[PDB]
Short mmCIF file of C-alpha atoms and ligand atoms in Angstrom, two decimals:
data_model
loop_
_atom_site.label_atom_id
_atom_site.label_comp_id
_atom_site.label_asym_id
_atom_site.label_seq_id
_atom_site.Cartn_x
_atom_site.Cartn_y
_atom_site.Cartn_z
CA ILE A 1 -14.46 4.64 4.05
CA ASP A 2 -12.77 2.19 6.48
CA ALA A 3 -9.27 2.35 5.05
CA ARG A 4 -7.69 0.38 7.88
CA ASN A 5 -9.91 -2.62 7.22
CA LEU A 6 -9.50 -2.46 3.46
CA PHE A 7 -5.75 -2.39 4.11
CA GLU A 8 -5.55 -5.34 6.46
CA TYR A 9 -7.53 -7.61 4.14
CA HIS A 10 -5.99 -6.50 0.85
CA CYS A 11 -2.56 -5.16 1.75
CA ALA A 12 -1.31 -6.38 5.14
CA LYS A 13 -0.65 -9.73 3.37
CA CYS A 14 2.70 -8.17 2.40
CA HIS A 15 3.25 -4.87 4.23
CA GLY A 16 2.13 -6.22 7.60
CA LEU A 17 -0.60 -4.85 9.80
CA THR A 18 1.68 -2.04 10.96
CA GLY A 19 3.38 -1.52 7.63
CA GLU A 20 6.62 -3.23 8.56
CA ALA A 21 6.88 -5.72 5.72
CA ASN A 22 6.56 -9.30 6.96
CA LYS A 23 8.32 -12.40 5.67
CA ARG A 24 5.91 -12.66 2.70
CA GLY A 25 6.54 -9.01 1.85
CA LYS A 26 10.29 -9.12 2.56
CA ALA A 27 10.57 -12.07 0.13
CA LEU A 28 8.93 -9.94 -2.60
CA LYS A 29 11.29 -7.02 -1.87
CA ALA A 30 8.52 -4.94 -0.30
CA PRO A 31 9.41 -1.68 1.43
CA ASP A 32 8.54 -0.89 5.02
CA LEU A 33 5.66 1.54 4.64
CA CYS A 34 6.17 2.32 8.37
CA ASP A 35 9.65 3.71 7.83
CA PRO A 36 9.91 7.50 7.96
CA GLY A 37 12.85 7.17 5.60
CA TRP A 38 10.68 5.43 3.05
CA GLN A 39 7.64 7.64 3.67
CA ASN A 40 9.83 10.63 2.90
CA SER A 41 11.08 9.11 -0.36
CA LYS A 42 7.63 9.11 -2.02
CA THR A 43 4.88 11.64 -2.77
CA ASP A 44 1.12 11.16 -2.55
CA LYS A 45 0.69 11.31 -6.32
CA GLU A 46 3.36 8.60 -6.45
CA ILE A 47 1.55 6.45 -3.93
CA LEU A 48 -1.84 6.89 -5.58
CA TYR A 49 -0.30 5.97 -8.90
CA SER A 50 1.44 2.86 -7.66
CA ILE A 51 -1.70 1.53 -5.99
CA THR A 52 -3.76 2.31 -9.08
CA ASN A 53 -1.32 1.02 -11.68
CA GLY A 54 1.06 -1.46 -9.96
CA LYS A 55 4.59 -0.82 -9.23
CA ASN A 56 7.36 -2.88 -10.87
CA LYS A 57 6.19 -6.49 -10.98
CA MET A 58 3.36 -5.82 -8.75
CA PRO A 59 -0.21 -5.67 -9.93
CA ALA A 60 -2.61 -2.82 -10.11
CA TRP A 61 -5.48 -2.47 -7.68
CA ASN A 62 -7.75 -0.31 -9.85
CA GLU A 63 -9.74 -3.41 -10.76
CA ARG A 64 -10.59 -4.52 -7.21
CA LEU A 65 -10.84 -1.07 -5.56
CA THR A 66 -12.72 2.12 -6.43
CA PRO A 67 -10.84 5.41 -6.83
CA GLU A 68 -12.33 6.53 -3.52
CA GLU A 69 -11.06 3.36 -1.94
CA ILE A 70 -7.60 3.94 -3.38
CA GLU A 71 -7.44 7.46 -2.01
CA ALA A 72 -8.50 6.40 1.46
CA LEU A 73 -5.82 3.72 1.27
CA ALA A 74 -3.19 6.23 0.14
CA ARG A 75 -4.11 8.43 3.09
CA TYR A 76 -4.00 5.34 5.31
CA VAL A 77 -0.53 4.35 4.10
CA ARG A 78 0.54 7.74 5.39
CA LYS A 79 -0.98 7.04 8.81
CA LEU A 80 1.59 4.22 9.29
CA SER A 81 4.73 6.03 10.62
C1 HEC B 101 2.47 -8.44 -1.91
C2 HEC B 101 1.82 -9.47 -2.44
C3 HEC B 101 1.82 -7.06 -1.86
C4 HEC B 101 0.54 -6.71 -1.73
C5 HEC B 101 -0.67 -7.65 -1.50
C6 HEC B 101 0.47 -5.28 -1.80
N1 HEC B 101 1.74 -4.77 -2.02
FE1 HEC B 101 2.31 -2.83 -2.11
N2 HEC B 101 4.14 -3.42 -2.56
C7 HEC B 101 4.65 -4.71 -2.60
C8 HEC B 101 6.00 -4.66 -3.10
C9 HEC B 101 6.89 -5.90 -3.28
C10 HEC B 101 6.31 -3.39 -3.34
C11 HEC B 101 7.66 -2.89 -3.90
C12 HEC B 101 7.61 -3.03 -5.40
C13 HEC B 101 8.86 -2.45 -6.04
O1 HEC B 101 9.41 -3.11 -6.96
O2 HEC B 101 9.30 -1.32 -5.71
C14 HEC B 101 5.14 -2.58 -3.02
C15 HEC B 101 5.01 -1.22 -3.11
C16 HEC B 101 3.99 -0.46 -2.56
C17 HEC B 101 3.95 0.99 -2.38
C18 HEC B 101 5.05 1.97 -2.79
C19 HEC B 101 4.82 2.33 -4.24
C20 HEC B 101 5.98 3.09 -4.80
O3 HEC B 101 5.87 3.60 -5.95
O4 HEC B 101 7.03 3.20 -4.11
C21 HEC B 101 2.78 1.30 -1.81
C22 HEC B 101 2.26 2.70 -1.42
C23 HEC B 101 2.05 0.07 -1.60
N3 HEC B 101 2.80 -0.98 -2.08
C24 HEC B 101 0.82 -0.02 -1.04
C25 HEC B 101 0.03 -1.12 -1.11
C26 HEC B 101 -1.39 -1.13 -0.85
C27 HEC B 101 -2.22 0.10 -0.43
C28 HEC B 101 -1.81 -2.38 -1.02
C29 HEC B 101 -3.26 -2.90 -0.90
C30 HEC B 101 -4.22 -2.33 -1.64
C31 HEC B 101 -0.68 -3.16 -1.41
N4 HEC B 101 0.44 -2.36 -1.46
C32 HEC B 101 -0.67 -4.51 -1.70
C33 HEC B 101 3.96 -5.82 -2.25
C34 HEC B 101 2.60 -5.85 -2.07
CL1 CL B 102 -7.40 -9.33 -2.12
#
């Protein structure tokens, strides 16, 4: 699975290509995925859950993405630090 490319289409809209949240993401109170501080405040089961189910006001991706695709993405979110 090409998790980078799934990410940049689906996700980079808010988190930015590098995972520093851009002005769209900042305005929605997005975190900086790229931040080691943030990365260390979450687990993988937490990340997988939030992509699958949505997080506070944010929608779930388990319609548009397969479980496989969500896992690759979770592993990709980790590669941004
Ligand atoms: C804006 C329109 C977003 C898009 C598109 C995606 N995400 Fe997101 N994400 C966004 C916000 C505003 C937040 C914070 C929500 C809050 O109230 O805390 C998040 C959060 C995440 C997280 C962290 C989840 C957690 O429980 O802390 C992750 C791992 C994450 N987002 C990843 C992610 C992926 C993989 C996306 C594409 C499939 C994606 N997000 C889309 C804003 C937006
Ligand atoms: Cl999309």
